């Protein structure tokens, strides 16, 4: 089997991407944030504290003839950005882009943190990291991808995120029309439960490539590109007036600037992030100070190849017995 679904930016900055997901019988369609940095499929629901729901579409398990309470199971997740959610668990039928999994754990939120409430466009998350990170207790549950894997034509999914435009998540096949040149594959460590890999270096603008190992995660659920302070300083040094602002929480730059590109290495291959992709717009409405899309990972504990990086590529998440990642230009 295969599936194919369009993923759409939530706003004009590509702060996140939402993908429609059918849950239950009859289907209830929720727009979920596909997150290769976590492993829980959770949704706003009829059980979510009412004051914590503000415009989201909810899953109502009592209206699904295929929903079953997973007795005794609870979940609770805290994302690295400080957001969180928790609740209980149903199994139900879940379909993405025509690919159906029966008996998928659907984690129903009883509580969500303010950042989730305040984002009316995201109805929940669909985790695509390794199932070892799943938070369901006392019996850990599998991700949608792990459940689907054995049925797929090939045990892969691909992320093709758009810049200020829709893109695609495919399951079970590699669309050879969706990228240019060849896909370069690179090793993955699953030791921390992530799609963790080592970039071979970087360049800023038209500058020389610096060969250096940068260990990080391919994370569709993180907006920005978080890299070591040395790398990030080298980038922003090429932008007149750019500075790190402790009050704002990162590098800012004059909105009048033209940003240089940023290149990262994948083996001997190179992915170029255009300068425009690194502009996250005014820090507050009307400001002439703009927020940078490349930020330091110091204090995070890991480098994160978030959407800023991934959207410049066609990305293969190869879930074969020994997982790998593939990157192609597009
Ligand atoms: O928390 C995030 C992104 N966040 C995920 C949940 C939905 C809203 C966006 N990413 C992140 C990814 C890895 C990290 C980390 C943070 O801090 C430590 O490691």
Q: How are the SSEs ordered, and which strands pair?
A:
Elements: E1 3-9, E2 17-23, E3 28-35, E4 41-43, E5 68-78, E6 84-96, E7 99-112, H1 114-117, E8 124-127, H2 144-149, E9 156-160, E10 167-171, E11 184-187, E12 196-204, E13 210-218, E14 225-227, H3 229-236, E15 243-245, E16 250-254, E17 262-266, E18 269-273, E19 279-282, E20 289-292, E21 294-296, E22 303-305, H4 307-310, E23 314-318, E24 324-328
Parallel strand pairs: 3-8, 4-7, 13-22, 14-21
Antiparallel strand pairs: 1-2, 1-10, 2-3, 2-6, 4-8, 5-6, 6-7, 9-10, 9-23, 11-24, 12-13, 12-17, 14-22, 15-16, 16-20, 17-18, 19-20, 23-24
The structure holds N-(1,3-benzodioxol-5-yl)-2-(piperidin-1-yl)acetamide.
